[PDB]
Amino acid sequence: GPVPSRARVYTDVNTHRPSEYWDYESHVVEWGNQDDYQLVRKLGRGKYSEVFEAINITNNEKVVVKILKPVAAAKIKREIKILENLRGGPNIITLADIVKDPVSRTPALVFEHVNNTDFKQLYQTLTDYDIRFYMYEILKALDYCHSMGIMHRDVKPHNVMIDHEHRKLRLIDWGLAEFYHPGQEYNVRVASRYFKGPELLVDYQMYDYSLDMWSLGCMLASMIFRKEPFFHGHDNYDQLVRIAKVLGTEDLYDYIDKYNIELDPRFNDILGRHSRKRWERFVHSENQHLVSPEALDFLDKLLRYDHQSRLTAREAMEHPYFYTVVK
Ligand SMILES: Nc1ncnc2c1ncn2[C@@H]1O[C@H](COP(=O)(O)OP(=O)(O)O)[C@@H](O)[C@H]1O
Ligand SMILES: N#CCc1c[nH]c2cc(Cl)c(Br)cc12
C-alpha cells in the first residue's frame, strides 16, 4: 500500500504536550452570556456557519459572531480547542467568547473584529513591498500554529483578514484546522479547490503542516502573476491536470512512485505528458512590477509535488524575498 510519511518539523509537539491540549473531545466548554452581544448585520453564510457583525455591549466594541449550523457544530470542540490553544499567537484571530445562540440552539463563537480592507481592493492594489510584508505576517501565523501542533488546512485569501491602514493581518476560519499526529490518516476533503495540494488530489491521507505551504504558494502565485486563481481546475481532477501543466508530469509520477500511491485510473485519459514550465513563462507587462528573481525562487520552493520537499514556514521566513521587509 502507500508508504507512510511524517512531517520533517514539529513531529513531537502533541506527544510532549499534555493530553488535555489535543484531546478536544474531553474539553469542557466554558459558556459565556449570549445577552452581551447585539447582532448588527449578517456578513455571510458559508456551508457551516452564518457570520454576523455584532456589538459587545459590555465595552461597546465591534465583534464578529459565527453561529454554527446544526450539521456541523459536532466538530465545535475541535475548533474551540484550537482557537483556545492558539489564542494570543502572532496574527491569529482572537476568540473572545463562546455562547449558546438562543435561536439556533447551537454554539456561537465570538471573535475580535478586524476592519478588513475590501478583498478586491487588496488583490488589485497591494504593491510588491506590501505582498512581501503581508506574506511575512502570514508566515508568522503559520509557523506559530505548526509549532503548536496544528495545521490550518484552509489557507486561502478569504481566510486572511488585512486591515491595511494599521498594517494588521489575521488568519481566520479555523473550522477545518486539525491537530497533527504523526502517522494519522486525515480526510483529503479539506481546503478550497484552487488551494488543494497534490497530496489531497492524489488521495494521500498521511499529510501534514506542509499542505498549508502549498496553499500559501498558490496565493502567492495568484498575487504576483495577476492570475486568479493560479491553478484554475474545473473540478478536483482537472485541478491536478492544471498543476501538471505547470510543474510537469514526470515529477508527478516520481511523487506517486516515492509514496507508492495508486493513482485514480480517471487520470490516465486526462493527465497527458507535460514538461515543467520555467516561472518566467508567466511574466508579462501587467505583472512585471510584482515579479523578481527572489519571488520566483521562493515560489518554486513552495510549489513542489513532494510535500516533504517544500519549505517549512520558518525556513520560508529566512528567504531572500523577505530581506527588503522592515523587521
Ligand atoms: N474577525 C472577523 N472580522 C471581520 N470579518 C470577519 C471576521 N471573521 C469572519 N469575517 C467575515 O465573515 C465571513 C465568514 O468568515 P469565516 O467563515 O470564518 O471565513 P471565510 O468565510 O473567509 O472562509 C467572511 O465574509 C469574513 O470576511
Ligand atoms: N489574493 C488576494 C488578496 C488577499 C487577501 N488576503 C491576503 C493575504 C495576503 Cl498575505 C496577500 Br499577499 C494577499 C491577500
Numbering used by the authors: 3 to 329
Sentences from the paper on this structure:
CK2 is a pleiotropic, constitutively active Ser/Thr kinase with one of the largest sets of target proteins of eukaryotic protein kinases. CK2α is found both as an isolated active CK2α subunit and as a larger complex, with a scaffolding β subunit, and is active in both forms. The work presented herein describes the development of a series of CK2α allosteric inhibitors through iterative cycles of X-ray crystallography and enzymatic assays, in addition to both fragment growing and fragment merging design strategies.
Initially, fragment 8 was separately merged with fragments 6 and 7 to give compounds 9 and 10, respectively. The merged compounds exhibited moderately improved IC50 values of 11 ± 4 μM and 16 ± 4 μM (9 and 10, respectively) and maintained high ligand efficiencies (≥0.50). X-ray crystallography showed that compounds 11 to 14 all maintained the binding mode of 8.
